Design a binder for this molecule. Sequence first.
Ligand SMILES: CC(C)(C)[C@H]1CCCN1c1ncnc2[nH]ccc12
Length: 167
Amino acid sequence: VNSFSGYLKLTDNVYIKNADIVEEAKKVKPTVVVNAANVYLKHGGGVAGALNKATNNAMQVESDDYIATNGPLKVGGSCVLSGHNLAKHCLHVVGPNVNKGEDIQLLKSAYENFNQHEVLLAPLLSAGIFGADPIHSLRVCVDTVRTNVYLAVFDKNLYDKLVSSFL
Ligand SMILES: CC(C)(C)[C@H]1CCCN1c1ncnc2[nH]ccc12
């Protein structure tokens, strides 16, 4: 039993809700919140910009030190950093950005990072400003993640479409 509330159950391990991931994280304080990161951990917009803003830019400060030490992530890769005021940890995961021409096959590799964590609050990888089809992202999530994932979908219209079209 966990404290996530109001989710629709899609499969044994995947749950979905129309919610602002920032507000969800502040309420639940999950062990792991997933960020829709880029390889530079530059949290300018989309989910990343919103999460970073909620940390008063502390996420960006920590991220800049991480990159200065380690260099950029790989597309499809991840790193674990602090969750600041939002969660215990933030798993920064880089899905392919279609608006940069990146290979959509890397979306499965991106979701594999979730399997290193028993429970996560997450957005749909590569959705929104990353330019992928969110219906496809949900399919890859369900077919790749085996741990317990609670998906927050900001757009109510998109949420209804994802549920109504889910196979
Ligand atoms: C559901 C959308 C397709 C709109 C995705 C893609 C881009 C960001 N977005 C978010 N998702 C969940 N919580 C969020 N909080 C702020 C943004 C945001």
